[PDB]
Amino acid sequence: KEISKDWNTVFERSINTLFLTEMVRGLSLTLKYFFDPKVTINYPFEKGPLSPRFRGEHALRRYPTGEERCIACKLCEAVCPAQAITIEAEEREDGSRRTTRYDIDMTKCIYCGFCQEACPVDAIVEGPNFEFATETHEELLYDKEKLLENGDRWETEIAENLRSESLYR
Amino acid sequence: GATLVGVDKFGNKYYQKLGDTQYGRHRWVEYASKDRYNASQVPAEWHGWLHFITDHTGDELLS
Amino acid sequence: YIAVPAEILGIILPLLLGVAFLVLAERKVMAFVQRRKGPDVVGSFGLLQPLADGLKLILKEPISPSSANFFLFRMAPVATFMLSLVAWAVVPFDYGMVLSDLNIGLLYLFAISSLGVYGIIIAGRSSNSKYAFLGALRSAAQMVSYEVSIGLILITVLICVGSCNLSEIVMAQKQIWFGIPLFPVLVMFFISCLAETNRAPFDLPEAEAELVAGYNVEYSSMGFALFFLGEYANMILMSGLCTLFFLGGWLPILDLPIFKKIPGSIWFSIKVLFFLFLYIWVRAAFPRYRYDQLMGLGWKVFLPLSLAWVVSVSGLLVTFQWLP
Amino acid sequence: SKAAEFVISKVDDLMNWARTGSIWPMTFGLACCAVEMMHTGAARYDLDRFGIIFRPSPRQSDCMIVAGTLTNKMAPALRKVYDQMPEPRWVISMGSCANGGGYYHYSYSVVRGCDRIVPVDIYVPGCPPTAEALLYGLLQLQKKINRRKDFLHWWNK
Amino acid sequence: FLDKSEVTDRVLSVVKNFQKVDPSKVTPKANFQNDLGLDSLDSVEVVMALEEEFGFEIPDNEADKIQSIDLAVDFIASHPQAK
Amino acid sequence: PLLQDGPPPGGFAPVRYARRISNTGPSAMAMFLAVSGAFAWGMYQVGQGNKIRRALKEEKYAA
Amino acid sequence: MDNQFIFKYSWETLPKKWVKKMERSEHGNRFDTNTDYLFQLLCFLKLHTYTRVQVLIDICGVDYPSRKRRFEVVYNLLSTRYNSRIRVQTSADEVTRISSVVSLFPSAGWWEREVWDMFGVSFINHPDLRRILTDYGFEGHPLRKDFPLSGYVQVRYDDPEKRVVSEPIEMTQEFRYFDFASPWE
Amino acid sequence: IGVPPNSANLTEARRRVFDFFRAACRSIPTIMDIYNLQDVVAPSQLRYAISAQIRNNAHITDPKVIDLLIFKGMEELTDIVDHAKQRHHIIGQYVTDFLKNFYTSNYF
Amino acid sequence: NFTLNFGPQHPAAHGVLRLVLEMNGEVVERAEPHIGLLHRGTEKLIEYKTYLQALPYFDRLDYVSMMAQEHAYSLAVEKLLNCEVPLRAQYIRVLFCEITRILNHLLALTTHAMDVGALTPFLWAFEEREKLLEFYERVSGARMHASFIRPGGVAQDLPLGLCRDIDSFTQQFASRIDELEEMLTGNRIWKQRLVDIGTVTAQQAKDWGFSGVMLRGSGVCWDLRRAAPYDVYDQLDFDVPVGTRGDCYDRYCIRIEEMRQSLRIIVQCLNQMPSGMIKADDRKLCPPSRCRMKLSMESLIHHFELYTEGFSVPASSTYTAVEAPKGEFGVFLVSNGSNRPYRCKIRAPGFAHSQGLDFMSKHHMLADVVTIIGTQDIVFGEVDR
Ligand SMILES: CCCCCCCCCCCCCCCCCCCC(=O)O[C@H](COC(=O)CCCCCCCCCCCCCC)COP(=O)(O)OCCN
Ligand SMILES: CCCCCCCCCCCC(=O)SCCNC(=O)CCNC(=O)[C@H](O)C(C)(C)COP(=O)(O)O
Ligand code: SF4
Ligand code: SF4
Ligand code: SF4
Known part of the structure; x- marks a missing residue:
C-alpha cells in the first residue's frame, strides 16, 4: 500500500502534477541550448578532425630514388581478410623482383590496415584520403596505376604520417 | 578573421581561429573557384593541416 | 462592390x-x-x-x-x-x-x-486501406473530443467580454489581457489547440498510421500536400486565436506612451510568432503521447476542469456585479 | 532558334537548382553503415544544412541510400521498394558491402552488390564510410544532377 | 439420397482419365488394385478424385476401408451433401 | 619508448558521478499563491474595465 | 560452487546409464550422454536442489564428416544460483531425430530451429520447426562441411520478368584458398 | 503440432506418405487462389506433378530417410501455403546426344 | 482477426526488422518476428580464415559495441592458447570495453526515445558519441570498426595525448548525463509510456535466457564481470544496479546507472593504469616491432610466418562469455589444431531477447510494441550472424 497521505505533502504533490512543474523544468532546458553555440561544421570548407593513424585511400609508395617499394612478397595478399588484393609478378630483365599486376578491389576492401602492417618494406599504405565517391563501379577496381598515382599525390603527407608514428609499433 | 595562415598554388586560402576550451571554427578553407569546387582541392601538404592530422602549416611541410 | x-x-x-x-x-x-x-x-x-x-x-x-x-x-x-x-x-x-x-x-x-x-x-475512407482509414478516424475522434474543451474555454472568454464580436473582445482588453487572470485557462486553451491539430505530443494517431503501413495507398504527388498546407494554416489560425482572446489582440503589451511609433498590426504578429515558436518548442521538448491515454486525458482532465473554470468565472463576476 | 536557347538554358539551370537544393533521401540502412549514415544526419555533419532530410516512405523520396549488406532474403524487398519511387530516382550505394560484395562477398545468402538489383549512380566506398565521405558522395550526386539538360534533350528530340 | 444412375456415371466417367485404364475394363465391379492393376498412390488418387468433383471429403479412417467401386458409389449415393 | 601515456603525477582530478540536482524554479505554494492573487486582481481589473466600457456605450447611446 | 565439486557430486548423484562420456578440465565440465537420455538428463539438472541449472545458454552444433555420428549438438547451460557452467553434448545423424528440450527451456525453440536450418538435425515434438535463418526456398544446409562457401545459387534482377530471380552461381572471381599449413606441426 | 518421433516399420512410412499427399491435395485450392492463377493451370495436373515427385524416390528403403523426406515435403508445402514464395515460382518449379554435347563444350 | 506486418524503413525499428503480428483489432495477441534478413553467413566464413583474419567479423556482429565482441574473441583465443597478458593491455582493454558500454547505452536510450517520440536527446547523445568515436579513431584507424584488440595484447600503444583528452571528456560527461536525464526521468509522459509495459519475472527471464539488463531489470543481481571477472575488474570498484520490477522503466534507470558506473570504471582505469609492454612476449601470436623485423632474422621469420600462416591453436574447445552491453555475449570455439578455427558459434544476446518479444507483447496495444522493441536494444547484426 504505497501511501503519501499527509496534509502538507498532498498539497505539494497535487500542485506539481497540476501546474506541469516537471514539464516546465524539462522545457526550460531546451531553451538553454537554443542560445548556445552550435557544434556543427560546414563540411566543404571545414573538415572534421582526424588522426595520423587514419585508414583511407590505398597508396603504393616508392623510394626517393624512384624505384617502387613493392617487391611482390605477397604478404599483403595472404593477410587480406577480404581477399581484395590480387598480385602477379615476374623477374624483370634487371633481375629485380617486381609486380606487373597489383590490383585492389576497393569494393571488397574492408579498410582494416592488415595489408599496411604486413609489408616488410612499407610498400603499401592507407593515406588520409576518404573522398573516392566514384560514379562507376569499375572505377573502384584500382589497378596499380591508380595506386602509384595516389602514392605520388600523397607522398609528402604519407611520409610525414609514417615518420610521426614510426615510434609506435 | 582572427588569423590567415598561408595560401595555396590553386588560389584557395587557409584561415585559423583559436578557441578557449571547446572545439569549433578552428580552421577552414576559402576556395578560389566557384563552379561547385568539387569539394576536393586541398593538396596533400595542406590536407594534413586541415584535418588536424599535423600541426605543420603545409608550406613548412613542403620543406 | x-x-x-x-x-x-x-x-x-x-x-x-x-x-x-x-x-x-x-x-x-x-x-x-x-x-x-x-x-x-x-x-x-x-x-x-x-x-x-x-x-x-x-x-x-x-x-x-x-x-x-x-x-x-x-x-x-x-x-x-x-x-x-x-x-x-x-x-x-x-x-x-x-x-x-x-x-x-x-x-x-x-x-x-x-x-x-x-x-x-x-480522406481515410476514400484511401482504400484497412489501417489508414482507421488512423484517420482516430484522429477525427481526437479532434472531436478536444472541440468541447475548446468551446468551454471560448465560453469562459465570452463571459468576461459579454459580446461575441471578435473586434470587441480585443477592445475589452484595454485594462488587462484576460491572460493574467485566466492563465490556467490560457494553458488549457493552448493545450487544446495543440491537441486538436495533431501537432503536439498529442500526435500518435497518425504517427502509427504510417509506421505500420508506410502510406502504401494512392499517394498523389502534391495533391496530398493540401492536407499539410491546411494543417499548417490551422496551426497559424489557432496560434492567432490565443493572442486574440487571452493576449491583447493588437494592444501594446507593457507600454508607456513612448513606443507609439510602431503600429498595432505588428503587435499582433509578434504574439502570433511567439505562440508559433512555443508550438515548435513544445514539439521538440516532449515525447509523444499514446492514444489510449490521449482520450482519457482529453475527457477526464479538461472537460471537468474547463467546466469548473466556467462556473467559477461566472459565479465570481455575478457576486460582485462585475458583468459587462 | 538561338534566341530561345537562352530561355531553355535558364529553365534547365532553374530545374537543376531546384532538384539539387532539395534532395529527400530515403534511408534504407540495414547494417553498421546505417550507424555512420545516422551520425551523418546528426548534429555534427548536418545533412539538413544542404537541404537533405530523410523520408520514412519511398513515395515521397528523391533518392535512395543503400547502406549495409544486402542478403538474398532482402533483395526482393529492396527491388520492390525501389520500384515505388518517382521519375528522378537516384540510388547511392553507401559502404563496402552495398557497392559490390563486401567483407563477405562469398556467401550463400549475400547479394554481391546492390547494383545487381537496382541501378546505382554513385558508389561511396568505405567500411564504414566516414560521415565526411557520405557528405562528399552526396555532393558528387548533386554535381551529377547539375549535368542534366533534360529540357534541352526534350527540345532536340 | 442420390439415384444410382448419376453416381454410377460420375464414378465411371472420371475413372477414364488415369492414363492407364481401358474402356473394356471399367465396370461397376472392377477392383482398383486388382482388376485395374492400380497403384496404391493411384488408389488414393482415385478416391481423391471421388472427393474432388464435390466439396465433401472422406475422413482418414474411411480412406482404405473400401477401394472398390461398389461400396464407394453406395457411399456416394448415401451422401446428404451430394446432389 | 620509455614515454608511455599515463596519468600525470599525483593522479587526475576527482570527478562527480552522483547526479547533482539543480532544484530550480518556484517551490511549494509559491505558484499557487501567485496564480490565485493574479486571478483575483485580474478579475477586479476586468470588472473595472467592464464598468468603463458600459459607461462609454451608454454615453454613445445617449448621443 | 567449485568446478570439481560439481564434477564429484553430479557424477555420484546422476544415474550411471545416462552419461556415456564425461570430462573434467579448466575449460569446462562436460557430460557426453546418449541421444535418448538427453531429455531426462536435462530435466534432472534443471530441478535438482544442488544442481539448479535454470537457464540454457545456447544449443550449438559441430559437423565431423569423419565419424558415423556426423553431427554433435552441444547444450551450454548455466546455474545462476550456484554460479557454475555445465555443458552437455550428444551425437546426431543426418536422419536420426533427437528429442527437443523446448518443454524445459522455452528459449531453446529458436536455437533448435537454427540448428535444423544449419545442420539439418530434426527435433522430436518441436512446435513449429522450420528454417529460420536461410531464405525461403533454400536448398541444402549451409553449415555442413559439404556445403560450398559460395553456395549453389545466385540472385539477380531479370528485366523480361519484373522480379528478382535465381540462377546457378557464376563467380566473377573464385575464392582463392591459400594453403598455409606446414609440416613440423 | 510437434514433429512425429520416427517410423519403426515401412507400413508407418507408407501411411505418412499417404497422409502427406492427402494434406497437399487439401491444400491445392488455397495455393490456386492465393497466387491469383485460375485459367493458366488447372488443379488436375498439379496432382499428377505431386504424384510424380513422390514416386521419384521409390527406391528408398530406410524408414528414417522416408520420414525426413516427408518432413521436407511438409516444409515445402507450408512455405508454399503462406504468401512467402516468389511469384510463379511453383509453376516454373512444378511443370545422337553425343554430337549435341560435343558441339557445345568439352565437359558435356 | 487480421495479421498485418511491419518493416518500416526509417530507423525507428532499427531497420531490417520484419514483424508479422496478429492483433485482436486494437490489442496484439501474438507477434512472430521474421529474422534472417541480415544473415550474412559469418559462421560459415570464419571456418575458412585464419584466427587473425576472422577478428574483424566480430566488429561487424554488434556494431555499437565493437570492442566488446573483440574482447570475447581475444579472451577465447587466449584461453585456448594459455597466453598471459601484461597489465597495461588489460587496463586499456577494460577502458575501451567501458567506452563501448557507454556508446551502446547512449545509442539504445536515444533510439528508444526516438521511437517513443522524444527527438532532442537523440542529437545531444550523438554530439556526445562523436567525442568517443574520435577516441576510437585516435588509437586505431577506423572510428567504428576498430581492430584494436588482438588476441595477444592490443594492436598498438596509446597515443601520448589520449589520456588527457579522455579525462577532459569524463569531467563533463556526468553533467551531460544529468542534462539528458532531466528530460526523461522527471517527465510524466515518459513514465506513462513505460510503466507497467513488458513486465518480465525473474523466473521467466531465466527461462527465456534474458541475461543482461533484461535480467537485472527483473531483480536478479547477475553480472558477468562480478560473477566471473575476466580482466582487471577485481581491482576496480563499481556497483551493480538491480531493478525492483522490470517493465521498460527500471531497465531504463538501470541503463542510466550503468552509464554512470562505466564512467566511474573509466576514471579508475585512467588513474590506475601502469606502464609496460602491451603485447605478450610469447611471439607466437604477437608480431615483432617494425624496427626488429628489419634488423633481426628471427623477428622477420616470425613476422612472415604469422602474417600468412598465423598461430596454430592447440586442438580443444572452449566457451567464453563476457558482459557485453546488450548482455551475455558468448563465443564457442572448437579448435581443430590447425591455424583455422574448426567451428565458431557466436551466442548473440539479442537472439534470446528477440525470441522473448512474443510473450512480452502479449495483450498489449500496438503503440506498446515499438517501446518493447526499443527497451531491449536489439541489433540484427548479432541476431542474424
Ligand atoms: C506566458 C504566456 C504563455 C502562453 C502559453 C501558456 C503556457 C503553455 C505552457 C505549456 C507547456 C506544457 C505543454 C505540455 C502539453 C502536454 C501537457 C499535458 C499534460 C497534462 O495534461 O497533465 C494533466 C494536468 O494538466 C493540467 O491540469 C493543465 C491545466 C492547468 C490547471 C490549473 C492549474 C492551477 C489551478 C489553480 C487555479 C487557481 C485559481 C482558483 C480561483 C494531468 O496530468 P496527469 O496525467 O499526471 O493526471 C493524472 C490523471 N489521470
Ligand atoms: C504444391 C505442392 C506442395 C508440395 C510439393 C512437394 C513436392 C515433393 C513431394 C515430396 C517428395 C518426396 O520425396 S516425400 C515422400 C517420399 N516417400 C516415398 O518416396 C515412399 C517410397 N515409395 C513407396 O513406398 C511405394 O513404392 C509407393 C510409391 C509409395 C507406392 O508404391 P506401392 O504401393 O506399389 O508399394
Ligand atoms: S606486402 Fe607490400 S611489398 Fe609485399 S607484395 Fe604486398 S604491396 Fe608489395
Ligand atoms: S585494408 Fe584489409 S581488406 Fe583492404 S586490402 Fe588491406 S588487408 Fe585487404
Ligand atoms: S561496408 Fe563494412 S560497415 Fe558497411 S555494412 Fe559492409 S561490413 Fe558493415
Missing part, C-alpha cells in the same frame, strides 16, 4: 507563403534546439529552401490512380483547405484590418473548426 476579390487574394497568398516559411521556421528552430544549423546552404539563411522544395514537388510524376470513385479523394483536400481558409475571414488584425465583421464571429469560428473533421474522415 468589386473590391472584395482583391482583399481575398491579399489574405490568401500571404497565408500560403507564410505556411511555407513556417515549415522553414519549424525545421530551423528544431535544428537550433538540437545544436544544429538546419537549412543554410540554399539561399542566404535557408530562405530559398521552401521555394526549392515547391519546385521539386511540382517537377515529379504524380501517382494518381486513386483506385476509387475518382471524386471523394480529390474533394477532401479541397474541403479541408477551403475550411482552413474561410476560418481566416473574421480575424480582426488591427482595427479595420478585418475582412468580415460578423456580429457573432466566435460561434462562427467554433462551427468552422467543428466542420473541419469530415476532410480527414473522407
Whole structure:
C-alpha cells in the first residue's frame, strides 16, 4: 500500500502534477541550448578532425630514388581478410623482383590496415584520403596505376604520417 | 578573421581561429573557384593541416 | 462592390507563403534546439529552401490512380483547405484590418473548426486501406473530443467580454489581457489547440498510421500536400486565436506612451510568432503521447476542469456585479 | 532558334537548382553503415544544412541510400521498394558491402552488390564510410544532377 | 439420397482419365488394385478424385476401408451433401 | 619508448558521478499563491474595465 | 560452487546409464550422454536442489564428416544460483531425430530451429520447426562441411520478368584458398 | 503440432506418405487462389506433378530417410501455403546426344 | 482477426526488422518476428580464415559495441592458447570495453526515445558519441570498426595525448548525463509510456535466457564481470544496479546507472593504469616491432610466418562469455589444431531477447510494441550472424 497521505505533502504533490512543474523544468532546458553555440561544421570548407593513424585511400609508395617499394612478397595478399588484393609478378630483365599486376578491389576492401602492417618494406599504405565517391563501379577496381598515382599525390603527407608514428609499433 | 595562415598554388586560402576550451571554427578553407569546387582541392601538404592530422602549416611541410 | 476579390487574394497568398516559411521556421528552430544549423546552404539563411522544395514537388510524376470513385479523394483536400481558409475571414488584425465583421464571429469560428473533421474522415475512407482509414478516424475522434474543451474555454472568454464580436473582445482588453487572470485557462486553451491539430505530443494517431503501413495507398504527388498546407494554416489560425482572446489582440503589451511609433498590426504578429515558436518548442521538448491515454486525458482532465473554470468565472463576476 | 536557347538554358539551370537544393533521401540502412549514415544526419555533419532530410516512405523520396549488406532474403524487398519511387530516382550505394560484395562477398545468402538489383549512380566506398565521405558522395550526386539538360534533350528530340 | 444412375456415371466417367485404364475394363465391379492393376498412390488418387468433383471429403479412417467401386458409389449415393 | 601515456603525477582530478540536482524554479505554494492573487486582481481589473466600457456605450447611446 | 565439486557430486548423484562420456578440465565440465537420455538428463539438472541449472545458454552444433555420428549438438547451460557452467553434448545423424528440450527451456525453440536450418538435425515434438535463418526456398544446409562457401545459387534482377530471380552461381572471381599449413606441426 | 518421433516399420512410412499427399491435395485450392492463377493451370495436373515427385524416390528403403523426406515435403508445402514464395515460382518449379554435347563444350 | 506486418524503413525499428503480428483489432495477441534478413553467413566464413583474419567479423556482429565482441574473441583465443597478458593491455582493454558500454547505452536510450517520440536527446547523445568515436579513431584507424584488440595484447600503444583528452571528456560527461536525464526521468509522459509495459519475472527471464539488463531489470543481481571477472575488474570498484520490477522503466534507470558506473570504471582505469609492454612476449601470436623485423632474422621469420600462416591453436574447445552491453555475449570455439578455427558459434544476446518479444507483447496495444522493441536494444547484426 504505497501511501503519501499527509496534509502538507498532498498539497505539494497535487500542485506539481497540476501546474506541469516537471514539464516546465524539462522545457526550460531546451531553451538553454537554443542560445548556445552550435557544434556543427560546414563540411566543404571545414573538415572534421582526424588522426595520423587514419585508414583511407590505398597508396603504393616508392623510394626517393624512384624505384617502387613493392617487391611482390605477397604478404599483403595472404593477410587480406577480404581477399581484395590480387598480385602477379615476374623477374624483370634487371633481375629485380617486381609486380606487373597489383590490383585492389576497393569494393571488397574492408579498410582494416592488415595489408599496411604486413609489408616488410612499407610498400603499401592507407593515406588520409576518404573522398573516392566514384560514379562507376569499375572505377573502384584500382589497378596499380591508380595506386602509384595516389602514392605520388600523397607522398609528402604519407611520409610525414609514417615518420610521426614510426615510434609506435 | 582572427588569423590567415598561408595560401595555396590553386588560389584557395587557409584561415585559423583559436578557441578557449571547446572545439569549433578552428580552421577552414576559402576556395578560389566557384563552379561547385568539387569539394576536393586541398593538396596533400595542406590536407594534413586541415584535418588536424599535423600541426605543420603545409608550406613548412613542403620543406 | 468589386473590391472584395482583391482583399481575398491579399489574405490568401500571404497565408500560403507564410505556411511555407513556417515549415522553414519549424525545421530551423528544431535544428537550433538540437545544436544544429538546419537549412543554410540554399539561399542566404535557408530562405530559398521552401521555394526549392515547391519546385521539386511540382517537377515529379504524380501517382494518381486513386483506385476509387475518382471524386471523394480529390474533394477532401479541397474541403479541408477551403475550411482552413474561410476560418481566416473574421480575424480582426488591427482595427479595420478585418475582412468580415460578423456580429457573432466566435460561434462562427467554433462551427468552422467543428466542420473541419469530415476532410480527414473522407480522406481515410476514400484511401482504400484497412489501417489508414482507421488512423484517420482516430484522429477525427481526437479532434472531436478536444472541440468541447475548446468551446468551454471560448465560453469562459465570452463571459468576461459579454459580446461575441471578435473586434470587441480585443477592445475589452484595454485594462488587462484576460491572460493574467485566466492563465490556467490560457494553458488549457493552448493545450487544446495543440491537441486538436495533431501537432503536439498529442500526435500518435497518425504517427502509427504510417509506421505500420508506410502510406502504401494512392499517394498523389502534391495533391496530398493540401492536407499539410491546411494543417499548417490551422496551426497559424489557432496560434492567432490565443493572442486574440487571452493576449491583447493588437494592444501594446507593457507600454508607456513612448513606443507609439510602431503600429498595432505588428503587435499582433509578434504574439502570433511567439505562440508559433512555443508550438515548435513544445514539439521538440516532449515525447509523444499514446492514444489510449490521449482520450482519457482529453475527457477526464479538461472537460471537468474547463467546466469548473466556467462556473467559477461566472459565479465570481455575478457576486460582485462585475458583468459587462 | 538561338534566341530561345537562352530561355531553355535558364529553365534547365532553374530545374537543376531546384532538384539539387532539395534532395529527400530515403534511408534504407540495414547494417553498421546505417550507424555512420545516422551520425551523418546528426548534429555534427548536418545533412539538413544542404537541404537533405530523410523520408520514412519511398513515395515521397528523391533518392535512395543503400547502406549495409544486402542478403538474398532482402533483395526482393529492396527491388520492390525501389520500384515505388518517382521519375528522378537516384540510388547511392553507401559502404563496402552495398557497392559490390563486401567483407563477405562469398556467401550463400549475400547479394554481391546492390547494383545487381537496382541501378546505382554513385558508389561511396568505405567500411564504414566516414560521415565526411557520405557528405562528399552526396555532393558528387548533386554535381551529377547539375549535368542534366533534360529540357534541352526534350527540345532536340 | 442420390439415384444410382448419376453416381454410377460420375464414378465411371472420371475413372477414364488415369492414363492407364481401358474402356473394356471399367465396370461397376472392377477392383482398383486388382482388376485395374492400380497403384496404391493411384488408389488414393482415385478416391481423391471421388472427393474432388464435390466439396465433401472422406475422413482418414474411411480412406482404405473400401477401394472398390461398389461400396464407394453406395457411399456416394448415401451422401446428404451430394446432389 | 620509455614515454608511455599515463596519468600525470599525483593522479587526475576527482570527478562527480552522483547526479547533482539543480532544484530550480518556484517551490511549494509559491505558484499557487501567485496564480490565485493574479486571478483575483485580474478579475477586479476586468470588472473595472467592464464598468468603463458600459459607461462609454451608454454615453454613445445617449448621443 | 567449485568446478570439481560439481564434477564429484553430479557424477555420484546422476544415474550411471545416462552419461556415456564425461570430462573434467579448466575449460569446462562436460557430460557426453546418449541421444535418448538427453531429455531426462536435462530435466534432472534443471530441478535438482544442488544442481539448479535454470537457464540454457545456447544449443550449438559441430559437423565431423569423419565419424558415423556426423553431427554433435552441444547444450551450454548455466546455474545462476550456484554460479557454475555445465555443458552437455550428444551425437546426431543426418536422419536420426533427437528429442527437443523446448518443454524445459522455452528459449531453446529458436536455437533448435537454427540448428535444423544449419545442420539439418530434426527435433522430436518441436512446435513449429522450420528454417529460420536461410531464405525461403533454400536448398541444402549451409553449415555442413559439404556445403560450398559460395553456395549453389545466385540472385539477380531479370528485366523480361519484373522480379528478382535465381540462377546457378557464376563467380566473377573464385575464392582463392591459400594453403598455409606446414609440416613440423 | 510437434514433429512425429520416427517410423519403426515401412507400413508407418507408407501411411505418412499417404497422409502427406492427402494434406497437399487439401491444400491445392488455397495455393490456386492465393497466387491469383485460375485459367493458366488447372488443379488436375498439379496432382499428377505431386504424384510424380513422390514416386521419384521409390527406391528408398530406410524408414528414417522416408520420414525426413516427408518432413521436407511438409516444409515445402507450408512455405508454399503462406504468401512467402516468389511469384510463379511453383509453376516454373512444378511443370545422337553425343554430337549435341560435343558441339557445345568439352565437359558435356 | 487480421495479421498485418511491419518493416518500416526509417530507423525507428532499427531497420531490417520484419514483424508479422496478429492483433485482436486494437490489442496484439501474438507477434512472430521474421529474422534472417541480415544473415550474412559469418559462421560459415570464419571456418575458412585464419584466427587473425576472422577478428574483424566480430566488429561487424554488434556494431555499437565493437570492442566488446573483440574482447570475447581475444579472451577465447587466449584461453585456448594459455597466453598471459601484461597489465597495461588489460587496463586499456577494460577502458575501451567501458567506452563501448557507454556508446551502446547512449545509442539504445536515444533510439528508444526516438521511437517513443522524444527527438532532442537523440542529437545531444550523438554530439556526445562523436567525442568517443574520435577516441576510437585516435588509437586505431577506423572510428567504428576498430581492430584494436588482438588476441595477444592490443594492436598498438596509446597515443601520448589520449589520456588527457579522455579525462577532459569524463569531467563533463556526468553533467551531460544529468542534462539528458532531466528530460526523461522527471517527465510524466515518459513514465506513462513505460510503466507497467513488458513486465518480465525473474523466473521467466531465466527461462527465456534474458541475461543482461533484461535480467537485472527483473531483480536478479547477475553480472558477468562480478560473477566471473575476466580482466582487471577485481581491482576496480563499481556497483551493480538491480531493478525492483522490470517493465521498460527500471531497465531504463538501470541503463542510466550503468552509464554512470562505466564512467566511474573509466576514471579508475585512467588513474590506475601502469606502464609496460602491451603485447605478450610469447611471439607466437604477437608480431615483432617494425624496427626488429628489419634488423633481426628471427623477428622477420616470425613476422612472415604469422602474417600468412598465423598461430596454430592447440586442438580443444572452449566457451567464453563476457558482459557485453546488450548482455551475455558468448563465443564457442572448437579448435581443430590447425591455424583455422574448426567451428565458431557466436551466442548473440539479442537472439534470446528477440525470441522473448512474443510473450512480452502479449495483450498489449500496438503503440506498446515499438517501446518493447526499443527497451531491449536489439541489433540484427548479432541476431542474424
Ligand atoms: C506566458 C504566456 C504563455 C502562453 C502559453 C501558456 C503556457 C503553455 C505552457 C505549456 C507547456 C506544457 C505543454 C505540455 C502539453 C502536454 C501537457 C499535458 C499534460 C497534462 O495534461 O497533465 C494533466 C494536468 O494538466 C493540467 O491540469 C493543465 C491545466 C492547468 C490547471 C490549473 C492549474 C492551477 C489551478 C489553480 C487555479 C487557481 C485559481 C482558483 C480561483 C494531468 O496530468 P496527469 O496525467 O499526471 O493526471 C493524472 C490523471 N489521470
Ligand atoms: C504444391 C505442392 C506442395 C508440395 C510439393 C512437394 C513436392 C515433393 C513431394 C515430396 C517428395 C518426396 O520425396 S516425400 C515422400 C517420399 N516417400 C516415398 O518416396 C515412399 C517410397 N515409395 C513407396 O513406398 C511405394 O513404392 C509407393 C510409391 C509409395 C507406392 O508404391 P506401392 O504401393 O506399389 O508399394
Ligand atoms: S606486402 Fe607490400 S611489398 Fe609485399 S607484395 Fe604486398 S604491396 Fe608489395
Ligand atoms: S585494408 Fe584489409 S581488406 Fe583492404 S586490402 Fe588491406 S588487408 Fe585487404
Ligand atoms: S561496408 Fe563494412 S560497415 Fe558497411 S555494412 Fe559492409 S561490413 Fe558493415
